Design a protein around this ligand. Structure first.
Ligand code: NAG
Ligand code: NAG
Ligand code: NAG
Ligand code: NAG
Ligand code: NAG
Ligand code: NAG
Ligand code: NAG
Ligand code: NAG
Ligand code: NAG
Ligand code: NAG
Ligand code: OCT
Ligand code: OCT
Ligand code: OCT
Ligand code: OCT
Ligand code: OCT
Ligand code: OCT
Ligand code: OCT
Ligand code: OCT
Ligand code: OCT
Ligand code: OCT
Ligand code: OCT
Ligand code: OCT
Ligand code: OCT
Ligand code: OCT
Ligand code: OCT
Ligand code: OCT
Ligand code: OCT
Ligand code: OCT
Ligand code: OCT
Ligand code: OCT
Ligand code: A1IFH
Ligand code: A1IFH
Ligand code: A1IFH
Ligand code: A1IFH
Ligand code: A1IFH
Ligand code: HEX
Ligand code: HEX
Ligand code: HEX
Ligand code: HEX
Ligand code: HEX
Ligand code: HEX
Ligand code: CL
Lengths: 332, 332, 332, 332, 332
């Protein structure tokens, strides 16, 4: 094998066909798993198989079998091999247990297949201002490092059919949909033009979990705060603790929701809901102070429900309804 | 030794017997420990010994002893060795202190034994919708990377007896049961067919700890909320703070249970319990407002227990009982 | 190629032109992304491309094409290459998947271009005493390790135009502004003088998020504490729980704000706001004790609003206003 | 030196004396520090020096000095060296700054000394059911990887005197006592018999810190709940809030103790204490409801302390005392 | 250069002058930064430059220039170099981007200078029983690994002037003071005597931040608890909730201070303050129960301030004052 190929009779720092046109190289990918997601750092981790095809007649051998052979890794450092890399990546590695996950098959003609197994972490810019009703889209990019479109030609081996995805892929916090591929040509100011391949996909959440954990308790709190309009205004020590305890409860809920968020420092769509229900509960406590002050001054002036109570009984819910209509018209 | 074997007289990029049938290779495993589990990331970590057997007559030597020899590691890179790898793995390594944990024994015939010590992290899809009453099953998969069933034949060396497990294995959060092995043949669309080996096992939790930490306090809270049906309706400042303080207490408990969960964003079987006891406590606070409003309007109209109290005293517990029956009929 | 260049006919431990003047070396940078920031550890992480230019006539070759060639990495360890390093850095590495991200281009003259892809973590001293109204500025420094200004001359290749920045750069907690470059000469007491290059930039926060999360609820709490001046002093069991519950609420808010801060142990500008509103709420609770004690002793002496109430109704808000004026005059 | 020893005249893949009996190899250890402990993962980290002694007459040299020489590391890969490894370990490494921490001394006879500096993480099964009154014992195990008791003989160089421990060893959460060594022979089903060395030690906690942080406040809470037996039963709005506020306080304490525990999911000895004091506080709140209901029905029937109060004043503390006696008889 | 020095004509496994006396080697250090501190693990991280000087006439070359040359790294593995290491260290490394941060300068005589750039984590035993009023001192130790005082002599190159410290060094949680150096001779029982160098320094905190965050709110709580001595004893429903709410508030504060401490399990000087103010608040709640019981029994016996109130008004503060005097006499 090491003899079948005239390894010492050629020069492999030289791309196959240095001189005239660019070498065609064709790519095939199969995704094994998506491993983790960070919302704070804005990135994701994926593990896949990567395959390459090309022809190099320096590697042809005399056999009659019309069938391929096999090598692994050691030969990659003797021969010439392409040099793809992952664009917009934070870290990556190739697996090496119990030996290097690298495969090499060569036919009599010198046609070649070359394959690896890798894990990549790759950046994805996200926007959380519609949280928890956001949708995100991410991508993985592949490019040649050293050779430009005048020396190497990059393309998907079988067009739209060059991506395969494993059956058992899932996340404990997301739903994954819409895998597909595309291409684009890209330019560097000090080095030139290159071809680039993409893999795209889309993410969404489970909205009912967030509904019950956040929107439901605050609504029950705002509804608890309307009870005070139906209690006798003469019962001061039963109308005064109620409001302030309700404020305490709502502040506890809001604090509890703040101590578990992914810690991204700009205003999002649930913060608005929570702070508006805080303001409603606060107004309910101003109302009864108005009523008490007026009843007391009347008592002093002289020496039945109050108008403000029987008006609040109507006004407060209608305005909560009006707020909910507008809010869900804006975030749908 | 390096001379006993004609190392320079052979070609080891070539599998033993390249040409005709596939080489038989036989595997034996002993598990040392399970090291950690992640419920958020859905994976586990294990450490084991791995052993291989095969015959290669390029390694035979003239001795009369009918007994094996020993080598370590350096020789593995001179001779031909198989290339197994762990399927659906996130990371792994071989230990190297104070030197490489690799052993090699060869007999006069050329029969070989080869062994390593490794640690692997490996994915396991879990479903937590019955939490804390869930059960999970995981597995470790082993496969050849480079050679197909037409070049290498993979099997357990001794059938069901090829797995051994250490005596002192345990986790601080789980109970481990039912180790066993099996096999399956698997197919890749661009490379072909391979043999694969499995090791399976099962996990369970301690249910009484979760019972006391979560289900018990909420039940005592719902039972505390029924006390208010037996207090005099004329005692407004002693019936009004009770309910709202009880709501405060229950919200504190629920928040405390949310700040320690493994953070998996979909609805599970304990969330339902907690939110239904929240709704019961909320209804208890609506009840006394009904009673107060009615007594007040009667006082105004004119100028003994109330029916609603003596009806609630019966209705509320029966419905809590009915909820518990249905809930534990569904989750058993 | 390895032959075109007389590799074995020269000595590369020797800088080009050892002897007379210093070699000119010129630098070009393109920033890909800012990856993370730590406020506790005072540092940041960046990923970029780095490019070098120089001439070495040991690498010239006879060709007529007036056009460059290509190599990658392996050649870097055969020839002489500069040795820049990142000053005030905690950690860094060069990417190596699927092979080393290193490029090398040589023209017939022996002019050279050399480029890498790296990730660096680099220290930045920050001062948080104006938090959340702080502004920070950071920088990345580049220097030669081994050769002084008498052997190597470091400069930007194109002056102000030698820095390029990617379009899609962002952080989930900051706004980035004002990239520019400069230079400075620097001195080591036991080794001598060197040239150094800088890249500078500036950071700011989103102030409205911090406003709503911190300053707003405490203000509503201080305003809730003024309600007690308008309730009848004869209603002791409705004036005594109010203050103490309000204290409870404010302490809960402050504790909630302390359990999420970046944990830097010196006094900052929001702590002052929070503790002054604590002191206001505390004084409101001392006030009514004064009023109760005086009314009781008058009752005992003998056997209408009180002056202190109708004075507090004016004094407390004016002093809160006066505090806000001074505070926002100091932090603007 | 490299010449003094006839390196190229011998074969070092071959253990000294391959053939007849087993080589004696003798071990000496000095512990520098214990570095960290994990209670969740059940393991510890230690750093030490390790020393070996043996004789190999392939390394003898003609000198008259009767005194040893020195080498470092590079020679270890030319000659034959033993292959010990740490049994039941999760990770380890050898230090390499500013070069490899390896020492080698050889005398004229061929006697050898060989020493390293390493850090190891090693598993320790712990049982926390007596927490905070638990005691744990851990150990570090040392074994040959490749050679059995028929090829290598492992023993402590000086018996009980072969372990030394540094003066300045401590942990910020434990007290360390009782270092000693021992040996045992161990068996592998597919490879055979080996010798193994042990180092053992013991751990304990500071019990008074846990006492004040956990047992003290709950006791004061249970004692606060007995005050309600001495207040007038006619004071409903002063007897009804007291109990429920006390329940709130105790639930806050318990939640605070749950949010800081090492997160091991089975019932331990402090959980029992806390939940029994919860049940006592709950019964105190049922008591006064009984008393109120009875007084009210008597008032209705007709139209002085109550017996239940003056009985509870005696019964509740005695039963708390009886619980404490039994509890501290069981956990001592 | 590689020729100027007769590399192949000498033996470098042999220290310069093997035989007679010990080689003098002299050390110079410059500290770049202190990077982080762990109070739980008791250690710190530092980054510095390290320099060595010695003479070796195997490296002399014929030149007339009386001036030094330069090499980098590759030569270190051809020639003989010392072998210093950091004593009591947990981890360390040498920086290697964009190449190895190693410098080598040789003069015609064979005098040598050798320098590196490293980061070290190093243990420091701390005692927190005076927290937050503690002071700590730490050190970094440097020693030869392989050679004893009979083969190598270690000393500071310029005495007290051999340490330089960067201008821009700081921590976000500490103040750093008092850098200085010293030396000591040290002994190993199985290997012998060595020289060791030290760098020492001192740390302190910001005490006013801890004062306002911890001591201030508890004091205001103890002062709030004295208000109850001035309210009318006839106002039961206004004297009974006050104490218990105050207890709730103080327990919340203490829990909040426990959920952010560096988690070191022994009693410290702030714990005492907090638990004594807890006991004061608890006694204030026992007091009014005494007063109520006595007034009630007098009412029953028959059918103005109470003595206990007008005595407590004096006794409680004086004892708080007396506690503060003693406490701050003990911790100063
Ligand atoms: C597997 C395959 O495609 N084999 C082809 C065969 O079909 C064809 O007949 C031959 C030309 O003689 O080239 C080869
Ligand atoms: C997303 C995607 O894969 N799109 C293309 C589609 O637009 C095109 O019309 C078709 C045939 O060319 O192949 C596929
Ligand atoms: C250990 C073992 O199995 N040894 C066998 C022996 O039993 C047999 O007699 C011999 C053939 O001569 O081959 C070998
Ligand atoms: C789980 C497992 O190990 N199962 C098999 C069993 O099904 C089979 O009948 C037996 C003999 O073939 O060996 C074993
Ligand atoms: C790309 C480029 O700058 N090429 C130049 C060319 O313009 C010039 O005519 C020649 C001298 O003959 O040197 C080369
Ligand atoms: C920040 C910066 O880039 N400044 C310089 C500017 O001061 C100078 O006047 C100009 C031309 O020399 O180039 C640019
Ligand atoms: C240090 C040591 O033990 N040296 C011994 C010496 O005591 C003895 O006299 C000699 C035999 O001639 O062997 C050697
Ligand atoms: C724990 C330990 O070190 N024990 C042994 C002891 O049992 C033995 O009697 C003595 C002398 O043999 O040496 C020591
Ligand atoms: C830089 C330096 O110290 N150079 C000295 C020089 O001063 C002295 O005159 C000479 C002896 O001829 O040795 C060299
Ligand atoms: C801490 C320190 O650096 N101390 C020494 C000092 O004690 C000594 O007297 C002086 C001159 O020898 O040099 C310096
Ligand atoms: C499935 C639970 C839905 C809760 C909706 C609450 C809207 C305020
Ligand atoms: C919001 C509570 C209103 C209760 C009205 C009851 C009328 C029967
Ligand atoms: C960007 C608008 C924020 C509005 C916040 C309102 C809070 C009551
Ligand atoms: C928000 C309710 C206002 C009610 C005003 C009533 C004036 C008589
Ligand atoms: C062993 C404790 C069991 C608690 C059961 C509580 C069910 C509500
Ligand atoms: C998927 C059904 C959720 C029901 C939640 C009910 C909460 C009261
Ligand atoms: C859930 C209790 C309802 C009671 C209704 C009583 C109507 C008289
Ligand atoms: C957009 C919200 C602003 C809130 C300002 C609060 C100032 C106390
Ligand atoms: C701070 C509340 C004052 C209420 C006054 C109402 C006068 C109509
Ligand atoms: C450095 C001045 C701090 C002032 C704190 C005041 C808290 C009421
Ligand atoms: C801070 C308010 C003081 C009011 C004093 C009134 C004296 C009659
Ligand atoms: C040193 C404090 C001891 C506290 C004991 C409390 C027992 C309930
Ligand atoms: C538990 C409090 C009892 C108080 C009794 C006081 C008798 C003088
Ligand atoms: C294993 C016995 C647990 C008992 C728990 C009792 C809680 C009140
Ligand atoms: C739920 C408390 C009921 C109390 C009834 C007592 C009858 C003696
Ligand atoms: C636990 C106290 C029970 C008291 C019963 C009294 C019956 C008259
Ligand atoms: C600068 C604030 C000092 C606070 C001192 C509090 C002492 C109890
Ligand atoms: C601790 C509050 C005492 C108030 C006394 C007021 C005397 C005018
Ligand atoms: C070591 C003495 C501890 C004293 C604790 C006192 C708590 C009230
Ligand atoms: C701690 C205050 C004690 C007061 C005792 C008064 C006895 C008449
Ligand atoms: N294809 C990536 C190259 O352009 C790298 C660089 O920017 O120099
Ligand atoms: N056995 C694994 C191989 O099929 C790898 C690949 O997918 O190319
Ligand atoms: N340019 C950095 C050199 O001065 C390194 C050192 O301080 O020795
Ligand atoms: N001494 C350890 C060996 O037995 C390794 C193995 O289990 O193969
Ligand atoms: N100078 C350190 C040496 O003594 C290492 C050892 O303890 O063997
Ligand atoms: C917040 C409600 C105020 C009503 C004044 C009449
Ligand atoms: C929630 C109970 C309402 C009862 C109305 C009669
Ligand atoms: C804190 C207010 C005190 C007023 C005394 C007249
Ligand atoms: C929980 C105490 C009940 C007493 C009934 C007489
Ligand atoms: C009044 C009796 C009290 C008994 C306490 C043990
Ligand atoms: C705790 C104070 C008790 C006073 C008894 C007279
Ligand atoms: Cl009342």
């Amino acid at each position: 094998s090491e003899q079948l190929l005239r390894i010492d009779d050629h020069d492999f720092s030289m791309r196959p066909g240095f001189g005239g046109p660019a070498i065609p190289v064709g790519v095939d990918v199969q995704v094994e798993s998506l491993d983790s997601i960070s919302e704070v750092d804005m990135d994701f981790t994926m593990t896949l198989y990567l395959r390459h095809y090309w022809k190099d007649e320096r590697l042809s051998f005399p056999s009659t079998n019309n069938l391929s052979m096999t090598f692994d890794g050691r030969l990659v450092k003797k021969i010439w091999v392409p040099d793809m890399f992952f664009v917009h990546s934070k870290r990556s590695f190739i697996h090496d247990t119990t030996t290097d996950n690298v495969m090499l098959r060569v036919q009599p003609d010198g046609k070649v297949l070359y394959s690896l197994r890798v894990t990549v972490t790759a950046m994805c810019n996200m926007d959380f201002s519609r949280f928890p009703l956001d949708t995100q889209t991410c991508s993985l990019e592949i490019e040649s490092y050293a050779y430009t479109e005048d020396d190497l030609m990059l393309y998907w081996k079988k067009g739209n059919d060059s991506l395969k995805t494993d059956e058992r892929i899932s996340l404990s916090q997301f739903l994954i949909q819409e895998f597909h591929t595309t291409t684009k040509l890209a330019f560097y100011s000090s080095t030139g033009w290159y071809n680039r391949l993409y893999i795209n996909f889309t993410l969404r959440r489970h909205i009912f979990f967030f509904l019950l954990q956040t929107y439901f308790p605050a609504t029950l709190m705002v509804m608890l705060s309307w009870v005070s309009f139906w209690i006798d205004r003469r019962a001061v020590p039963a109308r005064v603790p109620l409001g302030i305890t309700t404020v305490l409860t709502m502040s506890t809920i809001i604090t509890g929701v703040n101590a578990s968020m992914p810690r991204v420092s700009y205003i999002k769509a649930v913060d608005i809901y929570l702070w508006v229900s805080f303001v409603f509960v606060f107004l309910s406590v101003l109302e009864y102070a108005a009523v008490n002050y007026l009843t007391t001054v009347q008592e002093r002036k002289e020496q039945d429900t109050h108008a403000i109570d029987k008006y609040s009984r109507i006004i407060f819910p209608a305005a909560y309804i009006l707020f909910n209509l507008i809010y869900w018209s804006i975030f749908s």
